[PDB]
Subunit: 166 residues, 12 copies
C-alpha cells in the first residue's frame, strides 16, 4: 500500500541522503551539495510557502521517494512537477504511482489548469513515463542547463487539465 504524504521535518534525513546524490541531482539539473542544516533551514523558511507542496512517496514499509509540486501559481493555475525515487527502489513502479497521485492532487485539489516539467533530452525513460501519463513536449530549451561538464538541452513538457479530464 503506497501513498504520498506531506513532507515532514523528520523525513528531511532521507531527503538529505537523496539531495546529495550526484547521480540523482544530475538528471534533476540540481547540484549534489546541500548540508542537512541548509535543508532544515529551507524547510523552516518555506513552511508557509503556498507556492509549494512537497510529498514523500512511501510504500507499505519504508519511504521510497519524494514528489514536489512547486512554483504553484494561482492566477495562471499552473505548477511544476518533479519526482525523485531512490535508485535502490527503482523499477518497482513507484514513480508512475506517485506521478499519477501528484497529477490528481494538482488538478482535483489545487484546482490547477496545467502541469509542466523540465526533463533532460537524453533521459528517454523519464520522457517515456511522462508521455505515458499525458505530457506533451511543448518546448526544447537548447543548452538550458549545465551538468556533468556539459550544456544539456531540456524538454519543457506539460499536461492540461482538459487533456486529462478526457
Amino acid at each position: 500500500a503506497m501513498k504520498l504524504r506531506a513532507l515532514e521535518y523528520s523525513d528531511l534525513l532521507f531527503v538529505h541522503e537523496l539531495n546529495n546524490e550526484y547521480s540523482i541531482m544530475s538528471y534533476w539539473f540540481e547540484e549534489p551539495y546541500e548540508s542537512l542544516t541548509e535543508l532544515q533551514h529551507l524547510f523552516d523558511k518555506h513552511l508557509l510557502d503556498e507556492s509549494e507542496r512537497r510529498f514523500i512517496v512511501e510504500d507499505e514499509n519504508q519511504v521510497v521517494g519524494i514528489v514536489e509540486l512547486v512554483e504553484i501559481n494561482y492566477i495562471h493555475r499552473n505548477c511544476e512537477i518533479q519526482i525523485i525515487i531512490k535508485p535502490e527502489f527503482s523499477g518497482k513502479g513507484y514513480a508512475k504511482f506517485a506521478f499519477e497521485k501528484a497529477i490528481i492532487y494538482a488538478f482535483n485539489i489545487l484546482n490547477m489548469h496545467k502541469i509542466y516539467l523540465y526533463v533532460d533530452a537524453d533521459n528517454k525513460k523519464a520522457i517515456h513515463i511522462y508521455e505515458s501519463q499525458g505530457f506533451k513536449t511543448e518546448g526544447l530549451l537548447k543548452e538550458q542547463f549545465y551538468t556533468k561538464g556539459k550544456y544539456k538541452d531540456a524538454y519543457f513538457m506539460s499536461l492540461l487539465k482538459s487533456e486529462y479530464i478526457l
Copy 2:
C-alpha cells in the same frame, strides 16, 4: 462519558492525523495537506486569537474527534461551527453529542446570537444531524467549494438562539 476539552499542543498529533486525511477534510471542503510543523505554527499563532475556540472531543478513554467554533464575531454575535469525528468511531453517536455541546457552549458561554455552518448538499447524514439539532437551511451556495475535482454546492445552515431556547 463523552466530553469536550480545550485543544492542547499535545493533541496536535491526533489533529495532524485528522487534517492529512483526504476523505475527512473533503467534507470540510479543506485541503488534506498540513505538516505537523505547520499545524504547531498555526496553533502557536492563534493561541490568543479570541475569534476561535477549538475543542477536542474525547470519550471515556480515547480522543475521537474535534469540534471548532471559528469566525466568532462579537458585534453581530455569530460564529461558524465545524465538527469532525474520526471515521473509525463513526455511527457511535459522538457527532450528535459534540454538536450539542458546541451549541451549548456557543449560546451559553460566548453569548452568541446565532450559529451557522456550511455543509455539502450531498452530505445527507450531516444535514440530518444538523436539522435534528434545530438548524434550518437559509441558502444554497452553488459551486461554492471545489473538492475531488468538482465544484460542490453547499447549504448554509443556521440556528438562532431564540429558536434554540424553545
Copy 3:
C-alpha cells in the same frame, strides 16, 4: 473614470469614509477607525494576497472604494464590497465601479464566483447587483447588527459562467 490600486496617500479619504455612520451601515461595519489604525492595517495587509482594495475616481477627484476580499484561490471565490461617497450618489459611480470590479475578479484573478452580503432592506443596492447578474442564493436572517437592530442579509452571487453569457 477608473479603478486604481489603493495607496497610502489615499487613506485620508478612506478614513473620512470609514468613520461615517450612514455609509458603513450598508456594510454592517462599525464607523470607528483612527487614521493611525487604518495606516497600520494598510501596512499590515500590504502583501496580503487575499485582499484587493481599489480607489474609484472620476475625471477629477476620488469618489469611492471597492474591495475584493476573502479571496480563496482554491475554491476560486471572493467577496466584493463597494462604497461610493454620498455626495456623489445617484451619479452612476456605483454601477461602473461594480462592473470594473467584476471584470477584474473574473478576467485577472481568474475567479469562479463572486459573492456579497447586502441588507435585505437596501432595495437600490439589490437592484444594482441584480442588473449586473447577481442572483440571491440565500437569506441570512438576523445575520448582522446595526443601528440597534438585527438586520437580515441577502447573500447574492454571480458565477463566471453566468457572466460570459
Copy 4:
C-alpha cells in the same frame, strides 16, 4: 451641532492638557501626571485594543471634550463610560449630548447589554446628568478611591439596554 469622532494622534495635545489638570482628573480618580510622550506611547500601544473606544466630543467650531467606552467585555457585554468636558465649555450642555451619543453608540453599534460607570459621591452634578440619561445607582464603594488627600467614595451607576429602549 455637536458630534463624537474617533480619537486621533493629532488630538492628543488637547487630551494632554486635560490629563494634567488636577481638578479634572480628581473626578476620574486618576493622577494628573502624564507626559505627552507617555500619552502618545499609550495611544500607540492600545491602537488595536478592542476593549477601548475613545471619542472626541466637538461642537460646531472646535474640540470641546472627550468621551470613552473602556473595559468593553464582549462576553458579559458591559462597558464602562467616562466623560470630560473642558472647564471652559461648562454649562453649555455638552456633557448631556455627548453622553447621550455615547450611550447610543454603546448600545446600537457595539451591541452592549449594560453600561456602567464610577462617579465621585461628592459630584452631584455628574450624578444628576447620568440619572437624567437613565442610570440607576447599583452600589456605593466607600473609600474605594484616594484623591485630594482623602479616601473618597464612589457610586457605581449603570444602565441596561432594556431600560434604555423603553
Copy 5:
C-alpha cells in the same frame, strides 16, 4: 499544616485542570477554556506584574487550591480577592484558611486599605463565608455577568482595613 505559597510555573498544571472546569469557572464568571500553553504564556507575561499576586493553597500533602490578589492599586490601596478550591478538597475548611491568609497578606504586607470581590448573588455559600470574614455587600450589579446562558447579578462586596484592625 496548610500554607499559601507563591504560584510557580510547575504548579500551572494543577491550575490548568482548575481553570478548565465549567463548574468552577461558572461561579467565577470566567470561561472554562484556557490551553496550558495560554496559561504558561500569561504566567510569563505577568511574571513581573506588580498588580497581581497568585498564591497556591496547599495542605500538609497536596495542593488544594489557589488564591489571587489581583488588580492591586497602590494609589487607592485596594485589590480584588478571589479563591478557587478544587471540588475534591471542598468542605475541609481550606477556603476559610486561605481567605484569612490572603486578607492578612493584603492588609499587613501589601499595606492595602480595602479589599473587594465579586460574587454571584445566588451563591449563598461564598457570600456566607465572606460575611463571616467581614465583607459587606456594597453593591448589587444587576445582569453584570453572563454564564450558563443567563445574565447573572453579582454582589460587589468589600472589607476595609479599619473594620479588620478592630
Copy 6:
C-alpha cells in the same frame, strides 16, 4: 542618444505608473495592481538580490522605459529578459536599442551563456523585435498564462552567446 542605467528608488514613481497599467502588464502576464508602498518594499527587499538587474531606459532628455535581467542563474548561465517602453514613446525604436544594450550587458558583463524570454503569442511586434536581435523560438507554452479573460499561450524565445558572437 539612449542609454541604460541602474534602477533607483527615486525612479520607482515612474515604474509605479507602469506596473498599474493593465494594457502594459498584460503582455508581461503580470497583475496591474501594485501600490507604491509594495513596490518600494520589493525594491528594498531585492536590493542585494544578485539574481536580478533592473535597468532604466532613458533617452536624451527623459526616462522612457525599463529593461530587466531577472532569474540570473550563475550555474546554468541563463537569464530572463523583460522590457517595457511607455506607450507614449512608441514607434521611436527605443525597444530595439534598449534590448540590444541589455543583450550586450547580459553577455559581455554578466558572462551569461544564454538569454531567454516569454512573449505572448498574439504580440507579433515583440516577436519581430526579438527575432531581429537574433532570438529563436524554442517552444510554445499553450494556456500557460491567464490574462484578459483567457488562458493565453506564450512563445519561449532565447538566444545563445555563440549565435550572438557570429
Copy 7:
C-alpha cells in the same frame, strides 16, 4: 506659578541645569550629562512609576525642577529633590515648589513619609525644609563626595501625620 509634568521638550532646560557645577553640588550629583544621555534616560524611565519629575514655572518661563524619586509603594515613602535656577534665587520659588511637591506626595501618591538628604553646611536649605516641617532624623558623616571633600548629610524627613496637624 505651577508644577508641571516633565516633558521631553523641557530637557534642554534640564540639561542646562544638570551640567552646572554649582547647582548639582547641593544635590551631591556629578555635573556631566549630554543632552543625548538625558533624552535616553527620559525615554528609559518614561513609564517608571518610582519617579515623578516636575518642572517648576512661574508666570512666564521655567524656573526649576522637582523630583519625587525612589517611591516605594509598600513602605509609602519617597525621596524629594528640589533645584531652582540660581538666576531665580531668593525669589521664593524653592518654598512654593517644595510645598506643591509635598502636597502631591501626600494627597495624590498617598505617601506615609517624605525624606531627603541635605548638605550639613547648607543652612538655607535646612531652614527651608524645617519651616516646612521636616525634622532631622540622622547625620550621615562623610556620606557624599563633592568639590574634593567628603560632605556629611542630614537625613531630614516629614511624616504625613505631622503634616495634617
Copy 8:
C-alpha cells in the same frame, strides 16, 4: 571552615527558599513573595550590574545563608550591606563571620570609603552584632518600613573605613 562565594544560578533554589519565608524577609523589611522564575529573571537581569555583589555563605558542608552588598556607589564610595542566615543555623556564629568577610571585601576589594545598613530598632541581636563589628548608629528612621502590619522604626548604622583600620 566557613567561606563566602559568588552567588550562582544554581544557588537560586536555596535563595528562593530564603526569599519566600515571612519571618526571614521581615527583618530585611522585604516582601516574602518571589517565584523562582522571577528570581532567575532578576539574576539574569543584574548579572553584569556592577552596583551589586551578592554572596553565598557556606560552611564546610552546606550553604547556610547569603550576604549582599548593594547600592554600591563608586563616586561617594559607599554601599549597603545585608546579611541573612537560615534560622535553622542560627546561634552558630555564622552571621558574625559573614559580616566580617563582607566588610573585608567591601573595604579591601571595592575600595569603599563607608558601609551602611538599615536595621529594625527592635532587632537587638543584629544591632549588637553590627556594633561589635564597628558600626555606629547615625540616625533613627521612624516609620520608615512597613512590616507585619506595623510601621517599624529603623536604625541607619554605618562604619567608616578610617574607623575600621584602627
Copy 9:
C-alpha cells in the same frame, strides 16, 4: 572507495581537531587557533554563502581530510582550491583523489573557467601533486604570508578549464 561529501555540522568536531593543529594549518598559511564555538558560528554564518563549497574527504571507513572551494566568483568564473589530509593518513594517495574530485566538481558542476591555489614555495610535495593534475605556476608571491616566524614565498598555481579537457 574514497569519496567527497558536503561538510556537515556534525563533522566540525573533526574539522576542529584539524584547524587547531599548528603543522597542518602552517601549510595553509592559516592560524591554528579556533574554538569549536567559533567554528560552529562560522559554519552557521556561511551556511547559505554560495561563494564557498566545503567538502569532507572520507574513505570507506573514516574521515581523512577536507577539501574546500572558496572565493567562488561567478562573473570571472574562478575559485580558490584548498586541500588538507590528516597527517596520520599521509602518503596513502588521498590528496590526489581529493584534488581530482574537487577539480571535477569545480569545472563540471559550478561551470568554472579557472581554478587557482596558493602553495608554499618550499612545499615541493604539494607542488608536485598540483602539477601532476595540470596546474601551472603563474606567479611567485614573495613574502606574501607569515608563518613560523618567517615571511614565506608562495606560488600562485592555476589550471584553466581549456587546459583540463585535453
Copy 10:
C-alpha cells in the same frame, strides 16, 4: 590635494563613478550599483577594519577614490585600488593618490606588502605602478572577464623594504 576618509555624503560621487562602464572595466568590476545598495554597503562595512576607502580631492572638488582592501593584519599585506574620474585624466591625480595611499599603507597601517591586479593591456597604469616601485610578480591569464573578453592580469606588488630604499 588630499586624501580623505570616505563619507556617506560622498557616495553620490562614488555612485556616479561606480556605474560608468569605462571606468569600472579597468577594475574588472561590474558597472551596476544603485545608490541604495552603495549606502547599504557603506553602513555594512562602516566598522570593517579590512577596508580603508579614501576620497581623492584637489584644491576644489572631489576627483577620485582610493581603496586599501583585503587588509590582512597577520601577513601584513593589502590590495590597493585607484580610480580617477576621466574628466580629470592626465592631470597627475592618479600618481599623487597612489603615493599617498602607499604612504598610508606602510607608515600608518604598518603593512609589509602592497599588491594589486592590473589589466595586461593597460600600459599607462602599469607604467604608473612601476614608477612607484611596484614589480610584476606574476601573470594571471584569463583571470578576469570584461567587455565580453577574458583579460589577463598582472599581479604587481611592492614590499615595504623595497620602499624605504
Copy 11:
C-alpha cells in the same frame, strides 16, 4: 574665559575634523581615519559608558579643543587623560588651563586616586605642560606605538591626588 563642557552630538562635526588630521592623531598614536558616521556611531555606543568622560574645551567665543578622561577604573581609581587643542589656537595657553580643569574634575568630582597618560617621547612640549601640572614620568615604553613610519616610544606620566593636594 575658558571652560570645559560635556561633549554633545552636535559637536561631533568639530571633533570629526580633529580625528582626521594625521598631525594631530599621531601624537595620540591614533589613526587619522574616522568617518563622521563611525564617530556618531561610537558616540551613541558609549553614551552610557561610565568609563569615559569627553569634555569640549571652549573659550569666550568658540570651541577650541577637546579633553577626555577615559579608562576610568572605579576599583583602582585611575583614569587616563587626553587633550587636543586645534592647531589654529596654539600658543594661547588653552592646553594648560584645560588640562588643569580636567585634573580638578578627575580628582574633586570623580574621586579618582591617580591620573595617567601616554605622551610621545619626541613631544617635549606636552611633557613640559604635564610636568608643570605636577605629572612625573613613571616609565618609558619603547617601540610601544607605531606612527609616521616608525615604532615610537612613549613616556607614561601620571599624578597622584596626594601629590596634587600639596
Copy 12:
C-alpha cells in the same frame, strides 16, 4: 606532554574555579567575583574578538592553568600577556613552559613586535620568571592598583621581538 590549547566553553568550569580564588586574582590585580553565568556570557561576547586569545595550559592529563594574549593591537603590533597556574599544580614548571609557548605564538604567529605585562612590585617570583624569559622593567606605576586593602605599585615589563630573535 604539555600544550596550550584554545580556550573552550567546556573549559570555563576550570577557569571559573580559577577566577574566584582571592589568592590568585589578588596578584592578577583582578577581583575574585565572577559567576559562571557571567563568565559564559563574556566568552560568548568575545568569541569573535580578534584582540584576544585565551589558551589553556594542560599537561599529559589534566588542565593545569591558563594563558592569555589580550589587548592585541595590529597597528602597533603589541599585546599583553598574562598567565595563571592553579596553586595545586604550582612549582612543576608549567608557568615557564606556557610563557615560552605564548611568546612564541605572539612573535611567530600573530607577528607581534612587542609583548608586555603588568606585575606586582612585591611579587618577586613572577618578575624573576619574566626577567629570565627576557622582559625588562620598563615602568614603575606607583599605586596603580588596589588590592587586599592596599594601593599596590606595579612593574610594567615588556619584551621586544628584536630582543628575542637574538
